[PDB]
Amino acid sequence: NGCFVDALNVVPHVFLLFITFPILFIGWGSTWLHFPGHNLRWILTFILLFVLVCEIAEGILSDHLHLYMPAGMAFMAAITSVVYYHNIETSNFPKLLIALLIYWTLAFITKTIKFVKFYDHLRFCLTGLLVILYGMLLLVEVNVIRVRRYIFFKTPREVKPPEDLQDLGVRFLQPFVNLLSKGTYWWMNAFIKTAHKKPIDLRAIGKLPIAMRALTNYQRLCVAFDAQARKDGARAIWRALCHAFGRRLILSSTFRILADLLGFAGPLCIFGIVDHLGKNAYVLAVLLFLALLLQRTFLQASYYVAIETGINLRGAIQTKIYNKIMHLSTSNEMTAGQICNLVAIDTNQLMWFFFLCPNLWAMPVQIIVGVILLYYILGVSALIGAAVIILLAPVQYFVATKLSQAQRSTLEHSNERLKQTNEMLRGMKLLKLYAWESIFCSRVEVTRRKEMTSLRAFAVYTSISIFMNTAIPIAAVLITFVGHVSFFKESDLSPSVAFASLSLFHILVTPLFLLSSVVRSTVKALVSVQKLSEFLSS
């Protein structure tokens, strides 16, 4: 009785989709309350979305409408559960939670019946995954009622929704939104639309949440510094910052590595599609769509979390070195300039290095996965190509260094020019009272030629950089495809192999440039933190 069980599975989705529409149309026709397991619930809902896409793929492979309708119904059921939890987070109720719990229980029962009738005789894995996800969502609901006052005794002892991000006017609400918008930044639609019309200002801007201020970051940093100094330096301050900023940085880094994995994964499904048609492809196309969107979303969340940790760190160490500015002694002009450079360039170096910290962990795994993947697609010849592209990364660094050197020289000349200008633009009446102005303009032009001379070499290095940027992608394919025959087998190169190699070449060229800047930023940040330690401990 397969169709019988299929209809039995179709029923509960219809039940929920019909109960939701009156309440959804009431809600469609400013305090955010969050419940335990909200992030877990949204994660599980996205996993449900993925498994339902897989079930739709199965139903397409099989075809019999009644044999694949359950997936299309559970799709709208999960979307409506999302709308329900949005309507509950915007306005809490003890009854809508029960209305969701009933549906969860019924769906679990139907899936259990399906599993039993299958065991008595690809479907197996998808059914099991759905069972597990529905069970975990049921446990989340049970936790919610155990914490809430749904069926518990008289009063719930509610949380008094947090005034940290919902009290008197605040505009930057990142920590206090739906975990989908925490990823897709949907809360910025209102801000940007209002910004189009009315010019933004500090009165039109928000105020920072209690989660990120000078006081909060200073408190965490001084607690870590205290716990480290009570056990007694450069390494000390370093480990203090590390233990103080903790979980956020590693969270960003792991977001980043998972995104890197999926990005290395995309071209392989491209390859599979190209193979299939030349000799099971719509599924690969929709999977490619899903993997692209998810990879890029995770990449962006990673960027943002890293940037926010860096901004926290900048505020913290800035207010800390200002606290140190109060207790210093008068015996220690040059120190003032060194202090204000310690805030204008050293702190910016520290913070930008903290931006690039997760990239330094995610780059090696990216290049390793890239080389191992391209080897299994092109064979020994791939290795040769895998060398050439990699060889651009150290060379780039060298080029960069030359630039820096040139920059220094140029800056010197520039400064002198400014001096020879500051006189002319002050003795204006004196200058023009006897028309000695051309005589000084000759000297000013004499300085300018030297400045121009420096700029030639700088722009030559810039040209070499831009040239290598697009030359190495061409050279890789050249010396790889022409050398594929030369290296060994010289077997027919199907379009899939060549185009997958092309995709991987671009996906590997993009990260390679960043490693050079990362190395420079890291060494400069190390020097700047040594400087900060020498200052902060005088």
Binding site: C3, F4, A7, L8, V10, V11, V14, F15, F18, F21, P22, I23, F25, I26, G29, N92, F93, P94, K95, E158, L168
Partner: protein, 325 residues
């Protein structure tokens, strides 16, 4: 600066830190039935179609489960005679729900489960029909489109009448329908500091509406300038004419209450006048005019104003000068 209640009549003060513990009940329906006629029609057809499809699905399911949906001759009688596919099942659902009863497909006395599904279908249909009728009738009692059309002049003036300073402000009707026993509650707010060191952020005080021997109410047929005279006892008696235009923060609100004729409900109109809105030493233009055989009211001159050579001085100093003259 900040206003107390807006010109349109809505309130401006935003409430903060409400307990909000009691507002956790199901007042679902009435709020949906208050909505706009298009939105309300949309949600009504939505509810009806939702119930219809739900019970059509359950009937198709039960006909499939009994085996009566499997086309077979003999050895059975379908719980619902002449049922073939989901289309005929939905047709049976709409035939039994909205109580048309075509009777081409007949529910039989063989299956009590169909009897139960019918006995719950009919009662839920009757209950949803009853609520969706009561709510639309309660909606058709909406006369809010005709209410709140009352108008006041944008800025109010002060003049010198009967040797005393006076407040002049226009009100008026906009439809044929009258308003019964309309009363005026004229109030003034200000941040006040008591002599005991107590500072209040806002202080409402009643300024009287000067009518005959008594009375808090008026009679509205034509635009009637409300006539009050500030005296030494009035709270507004202490201000100055040159400090009101820019710096001071004084909101004079009027609350005109009254019951409309046709509906009998008691509506009201609240409006504010700021310190920068009110002006000094002027006179309104006479609206009413002796027409052919009636009185013609021209609303173009409603907010028009003419200069009057009246002395400009503070009400306290004006009362002192009256004691001197």
């Amino acid at each position: 600066r900040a206003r107390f209640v807006s010109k349109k009549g809505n309130c401006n003060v935003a409430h903060k830190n409400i307990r909000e513990q009691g507002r956790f009940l199901q007042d679902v329906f009435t709020t949906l039935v208050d909505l706009k006629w298009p939105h309300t029609l949309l949600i009504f057809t939505m509810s009806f179609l939702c119930s219809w499809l739900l019970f059509a699905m359950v009937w198709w399911l039960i006909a499939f489960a009994h085996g009566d949906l499997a086309p077979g001759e003999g050895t059975n009688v379908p719980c619902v005679t002449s049922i073939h596919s989901f289309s005929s099942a939905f047709l049976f659902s709409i035939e039994v729900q909205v109580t048309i009863g075509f009777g081409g497909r007949m529910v039989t006395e063989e299956c009590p489960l169909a009897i139960l599904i019918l006995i719950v279908q009919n009662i839920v249909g009757l209950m949803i029909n009853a609520i969706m009728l009561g709510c639309i009738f309660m909606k058709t009692a909406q006369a809010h489109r005709r209410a709140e059309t009352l108008i006041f002049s944008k800025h109010a003036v002060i003049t010198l009448r009967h040797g005393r300073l006076c407040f002049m402000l226009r009100v008026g009707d906009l439809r044929k329908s009258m308003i019964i026993s309309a009363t005026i509650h004229m109030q003034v707010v200000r941040k006040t500091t008591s002599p005991e060191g107590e500072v209040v952020p806002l202080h409402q005080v009643d300024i009287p509406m000067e009518n005959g021997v008594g009375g808090n109410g008026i009679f509205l047929v034509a635009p009637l300038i409300i006539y009050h005279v500030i005296d030494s006892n009035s709270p507004l008696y202490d201000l100055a004419p040159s400090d009101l235009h820019h710096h001071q923060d004084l909101e004079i609100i009027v609350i005109l209450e009254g019951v409309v004729e046709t509906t009998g409900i008691t509506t009201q109109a609240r409006t504010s006048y700021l310190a920068d809105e009110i002006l000094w030493g002027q006179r309104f233009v006479p609206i009413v005019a002796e027409e052919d055989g009636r009185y013609s009211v021209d609303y173009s001159k409603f907010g028009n104003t003419i200069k009057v050579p009246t002395p400009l001085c503070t009400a306290r100093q004006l009362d002192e000068d009256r004691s001197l003259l």
